[PDB]
Amino acid sequence: AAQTNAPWGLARISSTSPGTSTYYYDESAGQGSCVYVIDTGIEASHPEFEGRAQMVKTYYYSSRDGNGHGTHCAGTVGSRTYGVAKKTQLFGVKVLDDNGSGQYSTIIAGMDFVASDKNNRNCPKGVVASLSLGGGYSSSVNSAAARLQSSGVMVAVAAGNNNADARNYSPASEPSVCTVGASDRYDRRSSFSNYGSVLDIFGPGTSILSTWIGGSTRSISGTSMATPHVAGLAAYLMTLGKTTAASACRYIADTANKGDLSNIPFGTVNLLAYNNYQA
């Protein structure tokens, strides 16, 4: 299938080159797979989700995203217009408050939650977790992510927007997960994007169009935006049968566009998520 006049990020991910406008992808579209969105919640009634999204857990007084961050990320994952894996299932996990804050024990609780909850879901093609949040280094947070990954879930985490080595941030620094940097239109490292050896792969994170609260849409920038492209991509490849949860991150780097990124410091990968589609 082919989505004409798609947002740049989707197009980028199905091209070997920057500057195109069509998003080429298999019609299967990540159906049969599940993506947990661990953020501020999802606005589940948003028409773009076609009813494929639902909140599953809150750690606060409400199950609603009064922030926008989560709804934006979910859209990049599998919303009709704005998402990678247009027919996936989405589950919202609200670990962050409407102010976007969240204590580590809550984020650790949300991760253990996902590792358990997935057992009572019907997700034949597999399970993915998309985590566009972070903070200063923490071993417990890291270990929570590792557990999640080990439980059989594709874990993808934002590298952070400090324009620093991600090694000092969690859970970006956990080696076992899929730490995602951000890029821009022109195949440049996004200026805010963290870097370092712990990075596994890059994705589009600058000026990404996505769903927003109140049934709207918004362009925003960040490693949060990049993270979902990858999680959405993994979900997609899992339904096609190309890879598994355990090996998705590796697979994505093997098959990536290599050497195209600029502004990539020595020691960081020059790897750009790529679906390798061929009609």
Partner: peptide
Amino acid sequence: AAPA
């Protein structure tokens, strides 16, 4: 944490 915070959102990214």
